[PDB]
Amino acid sequence: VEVSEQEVKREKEKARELRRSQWWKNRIARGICHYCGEIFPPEELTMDHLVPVVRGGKSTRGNVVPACKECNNRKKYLLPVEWEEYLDSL
Amino acid sequence: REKEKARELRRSQWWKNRIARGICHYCGEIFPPEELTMDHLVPVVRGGKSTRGNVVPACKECNNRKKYLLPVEWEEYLDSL
Amino acid sequence: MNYFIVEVSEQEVKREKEKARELRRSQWWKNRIARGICHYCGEIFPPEELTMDHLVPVVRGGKSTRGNVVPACKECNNRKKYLLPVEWEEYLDSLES
Ligand SMILES: [Mg+2]
Ligand SMILES: [Zn+2]
Ligand SMILES: [Zn+2]
Ligand SMILES: [Zn+2]
């Protein structure tokens, strides 16, 4: 269910374009990380996609969420089973 | 179905503090626990589970407008925010 | 509107986070929280319930000094972080007595 490159980019555009609007602006202003609920400086939060871009995931308010480096990273490498033990360890 | 884990999160701590800060994911505004609902970012229909990641606070407007406005009409609600 | 980016190195952030740790242990600080007054809401709390807050955040250039350091209660300390400048004002302006 992988997508093409002119798509994996076709969205990473709607990303930077969303990443630059009131919604995302204030969102990072607050500093609250979606996953662990902790507060961080607006810079230490990343735009993370629930359903990946390379799986048909769109870049919208209904699929993109603020995440800190920490949570956002573990999400990438931890195993789908490990990701839970981590969020459930918080 | 997963409506089990569903009402579960609602009684959890991550969600208590969540609906206490009162931030709606969609419009970024703050509301009272009475105006906030729990919504699944990744619809449950398409096989979305009920877990910290795929569940966010949403005021009635955003929750209903997304759950009822056509694909083209929901996108318009946001552009107006 | 002209604008510029100001950067705060991680060397500077630690530097301030250390002076803070030292400032937090001073007789001077112990005295300040001993009074138990929250700088933001002016409500009274037990010394355990107060934390040190920088009016001007360290990542925004602020320093760890008596002037920029202030005692704050749990609620005020966070709300000052996740509420935008306007929700904060209203939050303050909505404290009775
Ligand atoms: Mg902040
Ligand atoms: Zn996090
Ligand atoms: Zn809303
Ligand atoms: Zn206070």
Side-chain angles (χ1 to χ4, degrees), chain A residues 26 29-32 39 41-44 69, chain C residues 10 59-60 77-79 81-84 87:
Chain A
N26 318 308
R30 286 181 160 35
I32 319 179
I39 306 168
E43 324 98 68
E44 306 193 61
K69 303 175 300 183
Chain C
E10 292 203 302
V59 296
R60 282 317 171 245
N77 183 54
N78 303 297
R79 276 163 175 286
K81 265 186 291 59
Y82 74 70
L83 289 190
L84 311 314
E87 302 181 306

Side-chain angles (χ1 to χ4, degrees), chain C residues 81-96:
Chain C
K81 265 186 291 59
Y82 74 70
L83 289 190
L84 311 314
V86 270
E87 302 181 306
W88 177 245
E89 252 70 303
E90 303 189 308
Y91 166 71
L92 290 182
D93 297 15
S94 65
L95 298 163
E96 188 73 17

Side-chain angles (χ1 to χ4, degrees), chain C residues 5 13-14 17 23 28 30 34 41 43 47 53 57-58 65-66 69 77 79 89-90 92 95:
Chain C
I5 303 287
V13 171
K14 271 190 52 185
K17 281 189 177 171
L23 186 56
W28 171 79
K30 272 63 162 306
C41 63
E43 190 175 321
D53 186 32
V58 172
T65 70
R66 291 183 288 182
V69 148
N77 183 54
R79 276 163 175 286
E89 252 70 303
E90 303 189 308
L92 290 182
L95 298 163

